[PDB]
Amino acid sequence: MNELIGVIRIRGWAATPWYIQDTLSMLRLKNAFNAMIYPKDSSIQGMLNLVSSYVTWGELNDEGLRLLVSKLEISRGKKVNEEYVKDKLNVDFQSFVESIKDGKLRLNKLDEIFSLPIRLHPPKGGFKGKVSRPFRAGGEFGYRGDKINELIRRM
Amino acid sequence: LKAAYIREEIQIPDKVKVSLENNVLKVKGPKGEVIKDFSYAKGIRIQLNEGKIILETTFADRRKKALLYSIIAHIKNMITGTINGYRYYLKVISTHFPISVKVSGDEVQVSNLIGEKNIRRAKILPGVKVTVKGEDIVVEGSDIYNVAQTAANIESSTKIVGYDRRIFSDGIYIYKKEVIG
Amino acid sequence: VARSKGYRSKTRKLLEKKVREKGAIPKLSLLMHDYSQGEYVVVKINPSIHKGMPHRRYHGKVGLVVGKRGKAYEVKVNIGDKERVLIVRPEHLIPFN
Amino acid sequence: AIEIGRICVKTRGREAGKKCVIVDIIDSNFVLVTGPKEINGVKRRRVNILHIEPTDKKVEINKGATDQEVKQAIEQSGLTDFIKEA
Amino acid sequence: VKIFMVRGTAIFSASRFPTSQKFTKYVRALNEKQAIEYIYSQLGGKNKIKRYNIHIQEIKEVKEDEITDKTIRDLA
Amino acid sequence: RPGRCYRKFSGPAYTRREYIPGIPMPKITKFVMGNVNGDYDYELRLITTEKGQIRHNALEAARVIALKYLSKKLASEQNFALVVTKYPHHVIRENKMMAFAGADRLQDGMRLSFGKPIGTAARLEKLGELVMYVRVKKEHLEAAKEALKIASSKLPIRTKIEIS
RNA sequence: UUUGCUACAUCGAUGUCGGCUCUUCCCACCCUGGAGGUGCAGCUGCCUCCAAGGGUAGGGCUGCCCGCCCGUUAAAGGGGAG
RNA sequence: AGGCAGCUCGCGGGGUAGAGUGACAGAUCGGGGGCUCCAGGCGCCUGGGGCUUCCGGUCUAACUCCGAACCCACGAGCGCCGAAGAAGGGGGGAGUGGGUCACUCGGCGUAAGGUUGGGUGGCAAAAGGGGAACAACCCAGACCUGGGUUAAGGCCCCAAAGUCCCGGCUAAGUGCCAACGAAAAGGCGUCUCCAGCCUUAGACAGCGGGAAGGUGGGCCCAGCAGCAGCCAUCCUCUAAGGAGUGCGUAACAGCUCACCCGCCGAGGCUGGAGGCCCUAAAGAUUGGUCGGGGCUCAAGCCGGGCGCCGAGACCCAGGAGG
RNA sequence: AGGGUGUGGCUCGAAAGAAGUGAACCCUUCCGAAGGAAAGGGGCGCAAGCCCUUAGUACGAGGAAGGGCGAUCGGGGUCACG
């Protein structure tokens, strides 16, 4: 159990039950191939259990986190007056970490607090890399331990 | 189970020469010689020892091991005929009409049965000798199968007694077989 | 077959009381304490007492003390997206938490 | 033939046509082989029986010999260099 | 060659019988990884038993001069 | 009516006599045979495999066939005892109205198609529940095996035997 | 194959029973072929299995179907195809 | 300037699944003990009738001493939307009141592409890919053009890519079928696995002998001289034998059964379960199949695995519109 | 069956469209999205292949420059096959 957790959605947004369709919406997972980071807690645990059959989640590593963040683009940015700017440097931080953060003026120091929705890329070589059905428990949908880190590294 | 490595040997008797090639076996003996093919022994390797018969196989199933022993029996039977003669016996019992049989080349003919005027015939495999002395029919030859099928062919011909009559034990029937000579 | 909308309809064990507490009203201690405005209460109908019996539709819920009239209290409860007031004698009220 | 002492050639895998020598049998269709000083170096490991081809050349060895032993044995037959005879 | 000793649990409707005609087998193999495949190989298809209900209990090595079966013995 | 008509479950149980008037009398009347309290050694029982309901009609027939086979074997009071476990508590109901009223332009069809009591069944709710059992000594288990098995021939559902 | 329910299709029409003629299909074989058992001396039996190639009538009563019956025949099989 | 379609925590509600019946209400099977009455037989015994007690078992939509998962209330917390795009209030204009199916938990009814309920999902009004074609099955919500990567599925040819790998099994074209297509039983037919019993102090099988006698004891019985109807039973005995199994016979007689010896040197035998396969298994609608072609150490199945193709889903580039 | 669609073949092309102030067509150089190789090398796995390297390199949808060539293209009609 570590604080830094993440999730990737692989299912679409049709045929999505009323229970869950808004949850990912409440989890800002509007549509598949998206991610963000959360502080782990029992309160978060409920959603992942309830949305397990639609997503994949687990504990990040340093390698994944650095790779994950490096993707924020012209329309994939922090809540910096909306605009989803392309981070691309501390420059966007340097002029805009002075709003909610304190002391985080280094690109490396984003290991604590919050983020926004990010638009992912398809997993390389097929999400069905060794699997064929996306619906095996313990292998496909839900919690995958550290292995989520390599799974996102493929992304 | 799985038979791992089963090996059997056949001691070739004296006064016999044996030739093997192309998975085709031929055996020569004083009584006679017959060629018997064994191309159908998939999964079995055949080694012709200079003084015996080497039979080996690895990891046979339940099917194959029965096959292997089945192959074994014929070969010695092949040997047995070439040394000792096969002499089947066919004893004829008739109730009301005496039975007569005569040889026609490779074909046999029987008549004067329970009242039917028709002819009855059976086929004899080539290279097989069959004769009659009296009340009995002698079937000679080296190949064990050749006589029996020939003997059986007679048996089928004389079976016709069996329609809507309780069997009258009348016709040609097998008596005994394989005198030592 | 439509069912009658009797005020106690479909209550074969809703008003059944565990045998360990039958008889006349035991829990005098709960009643004696008095409520004021802003208090939060839980409704638990006593089937034995025939006075001021709230309807089954609002049983086992969270209530708010908004005032007092006579020997009884009135209680505000949200059921759907509306508001309602339940004037009840205190002998089916238990403090929350 | 397929028995100990046979020298064979690998069919599939990265080898795809180098020397190999049986050293022992293992199961129905796995056997133990090694290449003493194969020009790439054949790893002493299991091999599926279907993945070798029996040549004519043979070696006289004891069951479960070490790689040096066959490395030593090939000189008796001279096969230290006569691998590529066929 | 390091003959192996395998004793594991596989089930359809409680097919547990840790003795020797409805539950478990023997194996000859190099290491555990190659050995462990074999039980999957056979019991997986020979009796329609998924690797779900496969539960290996004991795996170990026996010595080459004491096995109750001679069929596994002579094949060396 | 064929036994396939009531093999599976169609709705809840049906038990309250006071609520369900006019139940036809079940065929089975005797449930225990043989010298109970007699000394027995082999302790074989009978086990079912799949769920379902069993009509009493077959059971009573199963009751008779078991008795005759044992009765001819040694005796009826001898060192054996047969006891059937279950009871036909469950009751079946069938819309027979399509027979009488189904040919006179009366309220035919699914109209008022509640069932009517014509038979009873011994309910099965657990996987592998006892149905009957027999107690014998060491010297007659062989006759007891088929004795249960021949009875099982008439049961609608697949059955299992055991030895104890 | 009928007969019970179902109302999914047809109410600006899919024209309704039988019979006549005519074609075809199926096999759960009536006979014809093959084989067998039998409480099969032989005939006549009785029964099982395979086998749809061919055949399987003519009359009386009843509109039929059904049914009863006449005298022969190997028998005078049963069903489908809106 | 809060709002709440979710979750967590805290704090409450519950009689359903289940379970129990000596905890009520009923249902229901038996035995034991005691008491009581009657019938029969010789005060006793037997059978039957009623009562009690003890012990055991069988069920409950309208039984509940208990009782989950679970669902719900409220507070706090998390999370999301919010002054770019706004809790509440008012106002103009509607159509909509015949649904269906799939899954899942019911009821009715056996049943039904039947009906009638709870929840979810399409469809209706949802294109695009697969399932052969297809309203509803799975993937997945089409501003447009183009590039790329992917999903559900598939990868011998039709037709894009694997005649891809390991291990094992199937002989029927069984099969090559998610939504759909065969029961009980029979099969040592085959392929793997549990028990139990004999086995090198010689196992099973196989091959000859001793395989026996007072005595064929026998009872009634012409005779039953095991085997006509009931049944016992000792030593002459020992590496062996019964007072004895099935054929039998009017009665025998006889052949065998049971046991040891001679060879024999590998397992053998009996209950158990499973997979695949065969019978069970028969309809024509007119004509033969898994889509066909066609396929049999598979182009099938099972255990697994490895590598790819595949859309408008996703990424990107350019244009467009609100 | 028909239509749109790709490749072509053959046909009409006065103006109304491009175009000699350069169409159409060839090269050469450059930039480069996501995405994304291979031979060789070494190692591992029975195998089927993967792992690091070669490298986000060659490559690439799109866009820029130069040159050489020299007048039809765009467009309409039909047909072949996908």
From Swiss-Prot, chain B:
Swiss-Prot/TrEMBL keywords: Ribonucleoprotein, Ribosomal protein, RNA-binding, rRNA-binding
SUPFAM superfamilies referenced in this protein's UniProt entry, alphabetically: Ribosomal protein L6 (SSF56053)
CC annotations in GO: cytosolic large ribosomal subunit
GO biological process entries: cytoplasmic translation
GO molecular function annotation: rRNA binding; structural constituent of ribosome
Domain of life: Archaea
Protein task: This protein binds to the 23S rRNA, and is important in its secondary structure. It is located near the subunit interface in the base of the L7/L12 stalk, and near the tRNA binding site of the peptidyltransferase center.
Subunit structure: Part of the 50S ribosomal subunit.
Family: Belongs to the universal ribosomal protein uL6 family.
Protein name: Large ribosomal subunit protein uL6
Gene from which this protein is expressed: rpl6
From Swiss-Prot, chain D:
Keywords tagged on the record: Ribonucleoprotein, Ribosomal protein
InterPro entries, per database record: KOW (IPR005824), Rib_uL2_dom2 (IPR014722), Ribosomal_eL14 (IPR039660), Ribosomal_eL14_arc (IPR023651), Translation_prot_SH3-like_sf (IPR008991)
Originating gene: rpl14e
Single Gene Ontology BP annotation: translation
One GO cellular component term noted in the UniProt record for this chain: cytosolic large ribosomal subunit
Organism expressing this protein natively: Sulfolobus acidocaldarius (strain ATCC 33909 / DSM 639 / JCM 8929 / NBRC 15157 / NCIMB 11770)
Domain of life: Archaea
Family note: Belongs to the eukaryotic ribosomal protein eL14 family.
Protein name: Large ribosomal subunit protein eL14
GO molecular function annotation: RNA binding; structural constituent of ribosome
Pfam families: KOW
Swiss-Prot record, chain E:
Keywords tagged on the record: Ribonucleoprotein, Ribosomal protein, RNA-binding, rRNA-binding
Keyword Mitochondrion carried by entry: no
Keyword Ribonucleoprotein in annotation: yes
GO CC terms in record: ribonucleoprotein complex; ribosome
GO biological process terms on file: translation
Signal sequence bounds: none
MF GO annotations: large ribosomal subunit rRNA binding; structural constituent of ribosome
Annotated Gene3D superfamilies: 3.10.20.10
Taxonomy, superkingdom: Archaea
SUPFAM superfamilies (UniProt xref): RplX-like
InterPro entries, A to Z: Ribosomal_eL20 (IPR028877), Ribosomal_eL20_dom (IPR023573)
Stored Pfam families: Ribosomal_L18A
Protein family (similarity comment): Belongs to the eukaryotic ribosomal protein eL20 family.
Subunit structure as annotated in this protein's UniProt entry: Part of the 50S ribosomal subunit. Binds 23S rRNA.
Alphabetical list of NCBIfam families matching this protein: PRK00773.1-1
Protein name listed in UniProt: Large ribosomal subunit protein eL20
Originating gene: rpl18a
Swiss-Prot record, chain F:
UniProt keyword terms in alphabetical order: Ribonucleoprotein, Ribosomal protein
Molecular function as annotated in GO: structural constituent of ribosome
Residue ranges the record marks as coiled coil: none
Domain of life: Archaea
InterPro entries noted in UniProt: Ribosomal_uL16, Ribosomal_uL16_arc, Ribosomal_uL16_CS_euk_arc, Ribosomal_uL16_dom, Ribosomal_uL16_euk_arch, Ribosomal_uL16_sf
Any one annotated GO CC term: ribonucleoprotein complex
GO biological process: translation
Pfam families documented for this protein: Ribosomal_L16 (PF00252)
Family to which this protein belongs: Belongs to the universal ribosomal protein uL16 family.
Name the UniProt record assigns to this protein: Large ribosomal subunit protein uL16
Source organism: Sulfolobus acidocaldarius (strain ATCC 33909 / DSM 639 / JCM 8929 / NBRC 15157 / NCIMB 11770)
